[PDB]
Design an enzyme around this catalytic site. Structure first.
Site, mmCIF file in Angstrom:
data_model
loop_
_atom_site.group_PDB
_atom_site.id
_atom_site.type_symbol
_atom_site.label_atom_id
_atom_site.label_comp_id
_atom_site.label_asym_id
_atom_site.label_seq_id
_atom_site.Cartn_x
_atom_site.Cartn_y
_atom_site.Cartn_z
ATOM 1 N N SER A 193 0.860 -1.180 0.000
ATOM 2 C CA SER A 193 0.000 0.000 0.000
ATOM 3 C C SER A 193 0.905 1.242 0.000
ATOM 4 O O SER A 193 1.830 1.351 -0.816
ATOM 5 C CB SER A 193 -0.918 -0.001 1.222
ATOM 6 O OG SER A 193 -1.840 1.078 1.185
ATOM 7 N N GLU A 308 -8.350 -5.863 -5.238
ATOM 8 C CA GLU A 308 -7.822 -4.797 -4.393
ATOM 9 C C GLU A 308 -8.930 -4.005 -3.702
ATOM 10 O O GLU A 308 -8.798 -3.628 -2.530
ATOM 11 C CB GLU A 308 -6.945 -3.838 -5.221
ATOM 12 C CG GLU A 308 -5.578 -4.403 -5.633
ATOM 13 C CD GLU A 308 -4.633 -4.660 -4.449
ATOM 14 O OE1 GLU A 308 -4.954 -4.264 -3.300
ATOM 15 O OE2 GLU A 308 -3.557 -5.261 -4.675
ATOM 16 N N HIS A 376 -7.246 -6.517 -0.507
ATOM 17 C CA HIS A 376 -6.106 -5.665 -0.170
ATOM 18 C C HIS A 376 -5.345 -6.187 1.061
ATOM 19 O O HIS A 376 -5.929 -6.436 2.114
ATOM 20 C CB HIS A 376 -6.571 -4.221 0.077
ATOM 21 C CG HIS A 376 -5.460 -3.210 0.071
ATOM 22 N ND1 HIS A 376 -4.734 -2.902 -1.062
ATOM 23 C CD2 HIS A 376 -4.967 -2.419 1.056
ATOM 24 C CE1 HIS A 376 -3.846 -1.964 -0.774
ATOM 25 N NE2 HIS A 376 -3.967 -1.654 0.504
HETATM 26 P P1 WW2 Z 1 -2.693 1.598 2.206
HETATM 27 C C1 WW2 Z 1 -3.254 0.043 2.922
HETATM 28 O O1 WW2 Z 1 -2.026 2.271 3.341
HETATM 29 O O2 WW2 Z 1 -3.913 2.627 1.697
HETATM 30 C C2 WW2 Z 1 -4.981 3.043 2.643
HETATM 31 C C3 WW2 Z 1 -5.402 4.590 2.525
HETATM 32 C C4 WW2 Z 1 -6.557 4.959 3.551
HETATM 33 C C5 WW2 Z 1 -7.850 4.069 3.291
HETATM 34 C C6 WW2 Z 1 -7.504 2.511 3.276
HETATM 35 C C7 WW2 Z 1 -6.277 2.170 2.311
#
Ligand code: WW2
Ligand code: WW2
Ligand code: WW2
Lengths: 453, 499, 485
Positions: A193, A308, A376
């Site tokens: 992420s 995702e 995700h």
């Molecule tokens: P990555 C898992 O850190 O992206 C986040 C942003 C805030 C909402 C959930 C996904």
């Protein structure tokens, strides 16, 4: 176990799955007071032995959202409650080496995710991966939200404070990791992420040169626009300053005012903002946009998950809407969002990297962990050996993944004995499909890329 | 236009002045120091942090914290622009503006004229003065700098915990920024002239006496103001003034160090209310710090560079008396102590006439001579005597751009020469052809000096050098040479003060 | 008088002491460090910024932040001046006072005696002690230094974010200012003696054990107080004390670094209210000033050292100030006195018994006395003697409220050392000053017209100072044995 670092001695503890675990080692100076919104400073050395046996503090972020994410990604049986503080520039070390002798095990530095707003290194336990694949696992922390990304767009607060800690953490490894049985010459960075977005940025930044030799972006790259503010950020800065009760007469004035606010105040500002700030072209870490830059050739693995936008993120035009929803009158919209956010970006990246002349490997994770398929972060439990901290099927999946990630960590090639062949992402666009049935396939998201492009 | 400086690239804008082929490049608000905020307050100026990419320099910088009313009033009265410009107040004010007639697409070494605004070291701003006219007309690079004012730029404890002259140090820092960067704007760093009026002349005078300003400039012009003008130079123990300021602001005065720490925590807004309570300018300054000034201006009487020194016919004619809220002889004279035996003097200027109307103008001439007249000449003489070129002048003319409330009988009032120097007749409207020409003449003089250290040139009445013949110039509708300026008064004042 | 120091010129004043031709030059309030304000708080002392022209140091410097009542009370009880002097409170207090009998218009290398006041490392000031008498009488340069107290000079987190001993570092910095400047006042930087009483002796003791103080002095005098006096040396994990202080002050205790940042923002006035609420921090093994405990350090092994105590240390002064509650009861109080004697609850009976088996009350005061100064001092003197260096031991205007039966009470020797009989017995003072002074030059107290002062060797010969100053032997020998066991 007592290791001897450059800044002093640190005392850890043995844990048998034995491994030596060093929790909370400072790699920078606490970014408090006037050090806020400034690059990280080296850490003051200490006399005697530093007891490093308790988890360091998350970094200031929303306490609810952070504890929720920690609970959903953690690979420990019981989740660990963290404290909040600006004093958070720490790293955790998990080493399988037998410290009573010389050892040059490869090193895998993990960069957590959380949209550059939440997260903590203590969430991910590297006891399993270290013990199983015989590597040194390091989980680092960096400043988040306002604290690590506030920018004025000028020399009074360039930004990317958070990305600079990541570099500082990487430099602490170069200078000290060998004291934990790790080879500073074989360092691999990986994260998911916002954590992948960071790995992607460090690969594009001149400042990170020579700090690592391999990279792994799990579900996230630099082109993932959401985390990279392009254009004039001054307006975002002025809003933040106002919401916080500051004047916006000039940039310098906004930063001085903000440096006086208490951590508690800046957290209420963060809360009012209702996010959920980001990587910017500062001129130091990033000189031009990720796109322009794609117009360090180190082995680079890039992968995404089947769905995702399946549940985790969502929970926490006509042409397109049509292109994904036309063929059925009766999930396709979730696939749209998915492709735009990770799918398409990841491949366009992998291709450029491949085209600049360096090794490139792609993968698509597809499996519903016991702890919607290929949601995700679902690959996280395999990478960090969650099944060891589970159907016999899952236990094996983890074993396979860890061996791949680990092999790459040492050769820049995931392949090895007892592992399905993982083709290299060359012109044949050969990638790997990881899941219950891990087999090679080709031209990942090819068609969509064309469409979106 | 995009110029490339030492700290980064700056982006300006082109502006064409009526009847000129080469438009001018204007760069507004360039930082020459680090914003003196927080702990940097009451400390020397710091170099400026460099910036990535191009810095947009197309909007006026803010003005150092000062009384917003009094400042906007002065800006409105001196400004040579048609419309006056509203400024913002901030401690973040260490900026400079550049006006260059050079064609940046080629090498150019035009002389440089750095302007130091006035305002009693309490008010003022660089943005008040527009150098589009002077630059274009005399082909020179005009630079208008800013420095800290009032408490912010002059607070002193008399010891190493806050020497003082913070404001004068910015002036030096601005001068050093020019040495290192001006050539990128078509200016020759080897030919730099400083000039200013009122508190601005007092500053030019000080820089000429300070070892720290050596090699930063090669010529000087003090317009209506020198270092000997006691009002702006606190001599003696300043500790008591510091303690009063600290108290008025709600600080303890246990020790010097303690006073400064306390004051560094006060907010800009608080320090402004302290300033307001103090009611200055209504009936802090250069001090002998040991760094900028080692001894008094008298004792010191230095860089033998060319110096022009001039005054105006009626310095106290309207502008100053008005602003200070003057009550309009021995009575007032004494009450005027903070600005300037009494019977002898009051008599010497009011005896020959019974007409109390006239006698009133004669008192205004007294104040005038003590504040600028006598001081200026005693200076010009010393400079002349140390062996360097010296030029004196007396401006005498009632500009049309004067205030409506200004009595028409007033001529050569404080700052009246400003409109000629800065080509006011070419920016504002309705100027008699006589005035247009006056400006042309003055700009050519100031400019010639800026390049040769000699005002003279073709088509210009001869300007004698202030040598033993004490030859000076009378600038006005009829610009002709004259001699021994204020000679007699100097003698008088130099004596009464002896005992 | 105008002397020229390394940081600039300082202007003093001449003061003549009755019956002396050479008046003395007094320089009051000279900065030896940079005001420890703002971000400099809880950090080592910084050199002092140089000043231009001439500094006007003719007025007493302020007193390190401490309890204003308790401090003014102690100043009033120890001061050797006729009238006590009212001090101001401030964090800006790193100053020293100089008293020099030398004739500055010529070269002079008079020995130097630097005084370190006492006050439990919580109160006190240099201005309390006037060195006009000692300087004039024994021809030495007297220097009274100041250092940070309480939270300000001793706050510790037990880690590199605030090691501690901020106060002891000023003492060293003051000592280093002397090395570099004292010669300009007629003093020989090669012959420097440090001496102090109570917490001030504890400091002299620590500096003698600290590697950082090496070469800054050549002789030492601990008056009623040594490093082994556990009360002032926090051994073990101090983190808990730090966390309490932070809380009492309204700070979070998330981490050490966080506690210190928070505390650096509190105002002096706030930190004083925290101090007051505490209703009292001390020397710690920081790793810089002290590498191991005073005990461990004395296990391993050398400048001459005089170590002395007073007949009745717990006679009135201390018990009074602490608001002391004054066989069965004894054990009660003894235990309640744990923060001062740290005696195990089980041992108590044996001790209470050993000293008590009206009079019994005085015997309890002797107990506390021996544990706090008696026994510690000797065990020290012995180690010093055993490491191979010269060692000397001794056993030595009171308040209206002080019972007349009290003799050799805490700090009573102070009036002799500082010639109180010449500012406010006369002979006693003369004798003492000559001893202290002789030692200051030879590392040996002996000289003409002075009873012989044996050296503390194996014969454990010490001096009994008083109306009848005669040699004696094996001081507190028996008690040491008892307590050591
Ligand atoms: P990555 C898992 O850190 O992206 C986040 C942003 C805030 C909402 C959930 C996904
Ligand atoms: P100079 C103009 O700087 O001094 C005076 C001008 C009129 C207002 C008060 C200060
Ligand atoms: P010593 C003089 O350092 O400690 C004293 C301070 C006042 C109360 C009793 C202890």
């Amino acid at each position: 176990p007592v290791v001897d670092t450059v800044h002093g001695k640190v005392l850890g503890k043995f844990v048998s799955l034995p491994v030596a675990i060093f929790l909370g080692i400072p790699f920078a100076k606490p970014p408090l007071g006037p050090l806020r919104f400034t690059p990280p400073q080296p850490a003051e050395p200490w006399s005697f032995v530093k007891n490093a046996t308790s988890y360091p503090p998350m970094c200031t972020q929303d306490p609810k959202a952070g504890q929720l994410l920690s609970e959903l990604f953690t690979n420990r049986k019981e989740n660990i409650p963290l404290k909040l503080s600006e004093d958070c520039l720490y790293l955790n070390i998990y080493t399988p080496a037998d410290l009573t002798k010389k050892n040059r095990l490869p090193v895998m530095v993990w960069i957590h995710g959380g949209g550059l707003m939440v997260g903590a290194a203590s969430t991910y336990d590297g006891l399993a991966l270290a013990a199983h694949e015989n590597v040194v696992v390091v989980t680092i922390q960096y400043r988040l939200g306002i604290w690590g990304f506030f920018s004025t767009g000028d020399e009074h607060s360039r930004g990317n404070w958070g990305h600079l800690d990541q570099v500082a953490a990487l430099r602490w490894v170069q200078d000290n990791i060998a004291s934990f049985g790790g080879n500073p010459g074989s360092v691999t960075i990986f994260g998911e992420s916002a954590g992948g977005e960071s790995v992607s940025v460090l690969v594009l930044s001149p400042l990170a040169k020579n700090l690592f030799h391999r990279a792994i972006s799990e579900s996230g790259v630099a082109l993932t626009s959401v985390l990279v503010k392009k254009g004039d950020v001054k307006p975002l800065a002025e809003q933040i300053a106002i919401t916080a009760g500051c004047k916006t007469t000039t940039s310098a004035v906004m930063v001085h005012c903000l440096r006086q606010k208490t951590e508690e105040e800046l957290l209420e500002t963060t809360l009012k903002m209702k996010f959920l700030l980001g990587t910017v072209i500062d001129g130091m870490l990033l000189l031009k946009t990720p796109e322009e830059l794609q117009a360090h050739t180190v082995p680079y693995m890039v992968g995404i998950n089947k769905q995702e936008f399946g549940w985790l993120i969502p929970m926490l035009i006509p042409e397109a809407t049509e292109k994904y929803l036309g063929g059925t009158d009766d999930d396709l919209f979730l696939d749209l969002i998915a492709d735009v956010m990770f799918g398409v970006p990841s491949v366009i990246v992998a291709r450029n990297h491949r085209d600049a002349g360096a090794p490139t490997y792609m993968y698509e994770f597809q499996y519903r962990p016991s702890f919607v398929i290929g949601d995700h972060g679902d690959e996280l439990f395999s990478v960090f050996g969650a099944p060891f901290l589970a159907s016999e099927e899952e236990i094996r999946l983890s074993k396979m993944v860890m061996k791949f990630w680990a092999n790459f960590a040492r050769n820049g090639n995931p392949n090895g004995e007892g592992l399905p062949h993982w083709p290299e992402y060359n012109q044949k666009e050969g990638y790997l499909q990881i899941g219950a049935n891990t087999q090679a396939a080709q031209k990942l998201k090819d068609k969509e890329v064309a469409f979106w492009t």
